Paper text:
RH5 plays an indispensable role in mediating merozoite invasion by binding the erythrocyte surface protein basigin. RH5 is not constitutively expressed on the merozoite surface but is sequestered within intracellular organelles and is only released to the surface just prior to engagement of basigin, providing a limited time window for antibodies to bind.
We therefore generated a single-chain variable fragment (scFv) for R5.008 and determined the crystal structure of this mAb bound to RH5. (B) Crystal structure of RH5 (yellow) bound to the scFv of R5.008 (brown), each shown in cartoon. We find that R5.008 binds to the top half of RH5 to an epitope predominantly formed from the C-terminal two helices (6 and 7) of the RH5-fold, together with the linking loop and the loop between helices 3 and 4. This epitope partly overlaps the binding site for the N-terminal domain of basigin, supporting previous observations that R5.008 directly blocks basigin binding. Comparison of the R5.008-bound structure with structures of RH5 bound to epitope I (R5.004) and epitope II (R5.016) shows that these three epitopes cover much of the top half of RH5.
Numbering used by the authors:
A (entry chain B): 157 to 244, 299 to 505
B (entry chain A): 1 to 122, 137 to 243
Write the structure that this text describes.
């Protein structure tokens, strides 16, 4: 359902949506599909078919995505008229935006039933893999699936986030939005109404949202970083009862899938944020050009 | 400072219901798993139920299954136990204790509440504590033994239940001294056999003493070791 859909324009000519509870739902079974095959070395040979099934699923889900493409291209088209209002009083094509934006969310909820069929196929596949899990005695279950899988598929993702300063990344994006406001203040003052002073206001505000979506996803990134790093130490280098092992691997597939969601989206949002920052620079220069001319 | 004040206890006609609650103060409640452990009259420590820090997972003792229900409200910092279908076996002092380890409440119990009394008006690992009763004089090196029915690797913790007061943790990993516990107390062991060593018994009469495994699902306790001076 809506309120949980993210818009992404990493490129100038690119726009894609993402249903956050779907990417997390799919990522969750992506983990316990792997955790349930690396548990005992007798079963690693299944990765080829597991990778193969995730590909089949990611294709069926994106066939459903490509149905709304027609409405997508309308909005990509609407934006470009606002981006560079070259060849065009303003709220005329500006309102055409909000309605085509909302016609596409309406389009997704149309196939919301079609997305669930692809989702449960990931759960049904994930389940029949994790249920077949067995130990030699059920009293001493080995944390070898958990150990390998984290070190390989997850550890890298954690390491990268530790290296960067996701708080200076935010603190820098803010300085960009604040100086744009100060200069757009000086420009709307110096000349008054002009269609491009309204495109600067549009993008500036549009970028203010992408920042708030970034500020929020890095907060989940910060929390799931300490938790996954803390929790992991208690689920490896030991043996559990089988009913406790299955429990601990689900708690993991949860921390993972929620961390992976907020990391994957934060990158595309940073991508979109700085993609809109470029457009905002072109306009800014064109205005400075227009202004000095009058003098 | 920490505090787990419990409430909700009293006399109950057999077969009815009663709700028990716990008031958490002094720590990040949201990060800790909680446990309810009872002590029937004169008998030892029987674990009732546990819940994870996020309240997602929660497990019970075999006897109370289908009757009791644990829950927590992280905002108010509240833990509760809804006891239904009360049998005469549920007569006990009910302790609300905090798990040592975050999220899972594994590896023992940091702090304990005083406990609230319930009076009804009518597989799992087995710990075998060696000396049931023991009478020494001041200064004696004292030793108690705990035998586990299954190899539990260093997941052994020792507790000190003074006369009519909430248990207190002394050793967490098989040999790990809790800060504030004097030098004297020491533990050792692995797999199946573990032992606690009170060198130089000090005058604080140490009352009864219980061990606890935390490797498998129901964290089993041994019977006690009453220590007289």
């Amino acid at each position: 359902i809506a309120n949980s859909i993210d818009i992404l324009q990493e490129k100038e000519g690119h726009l894609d949506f993402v249903i956050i509870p779907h990417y997390t739902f799919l990522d969750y079974y992506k983990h316990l599909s792997y955790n349930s095959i690396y548990h005992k070395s007798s079963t690693y040979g299944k990765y080829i078919a597991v990778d193969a099934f995730i590909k089949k699923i990611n294709e069926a889900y994106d066939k459903v995505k490509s149905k709304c493409n027609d409405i997508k291209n309308d909005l990509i088209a609407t934006i470009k008229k606002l981006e560079h209002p070259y060849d065009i009083a303003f709220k005329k094509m500006m309102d055409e935006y909000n309605t085509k934006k909302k016609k596409l969310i309406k389009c997704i909820k149309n196939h919301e039933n079609d997305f669930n069929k692809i989702c449960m196929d990931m759960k049904n596949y994930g389940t029949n893999l994790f249920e077949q899990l067995s130990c030699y005695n059920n009293n001493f279950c080995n944390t070898n699936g958990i150990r390998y899988h984290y070190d390989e598929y997850i550890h890298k993702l954690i390491l990268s986030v530790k290296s960067k300063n996701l708080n200076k990344d935010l603190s820098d994006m803010t300085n960009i939005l604040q100086q744009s406001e100060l200069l757009l203040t000086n420009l709307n003052k110096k000349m008054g109404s002009y269609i491009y002073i309204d495109t600067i206001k549009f993008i500036h505000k549009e970028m203010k949202h992408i920042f708030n979506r970034i500020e929020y996803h890095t907060k989940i990134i910060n929390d799931k970083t300490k938790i996954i790093q803390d929790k992991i130490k208690l689920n490896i280098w030991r043996t559990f009862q089988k009913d406790e092992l299955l429990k601990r691997i689900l708690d993991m597939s949860n921390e993972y899938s929620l961390f992976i969601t907020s990391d994957h989206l934060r990158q595309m949002l940073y991508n979109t944020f700085y993609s809109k920052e470029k457009h905002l620079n072109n306009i800014f220069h064109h205005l400075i050009y227009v202004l000095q001319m009058k003098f | 400072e920490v505090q787990l004040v419990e409430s909700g206890g009293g006399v109950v006609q057999p077969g009815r219901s009663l709700r028990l609650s716990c008031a958490a103060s002094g720590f990040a409640f949201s990060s800790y798993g909680m446990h309810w452990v009872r002590q029937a009259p004169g008998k030892g420590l029987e674990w009732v139920a546990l819940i994870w820090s996020d309240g997602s997972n929660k497990d019970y003792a075999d006897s109370v299954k289908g009757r009791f229900t644990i829950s927590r409200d992280n905002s108010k910092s509240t833990l509760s136990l809804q006891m239904n279908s009360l049998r005469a076996e549920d007569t006990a002092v009910y302790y609300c204790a905090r798990g040592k380890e975050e999220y899972y409440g594994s590896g023992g119990s940091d702090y304990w509440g005083q406990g609230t009394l319930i009076t009804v008006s009518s597989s799992d690992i087995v710990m075998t504590q060696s000396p049931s009763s023991l009478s020494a004089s001041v200064g004696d090196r004292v030793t108690i033994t705990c035998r586990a029915s299954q190899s539990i690797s260093s997941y052994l913790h020792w507790y000190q239940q003074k006369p009519g007061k909430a248990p207190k943790l002394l050793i967490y990993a098989a040999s790990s001294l809790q800060s504030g516990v004097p030098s004297r107390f020491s533990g050792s062991g692995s797999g199946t056999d573990f032992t606690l060593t009170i060198s130089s018994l000090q005058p604080a009469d140490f009352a009864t003493y219980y061990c606890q495994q935390s490797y498998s699902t129901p964290p089993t306790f041994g019977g006690g070791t009453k220590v007289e001076i």
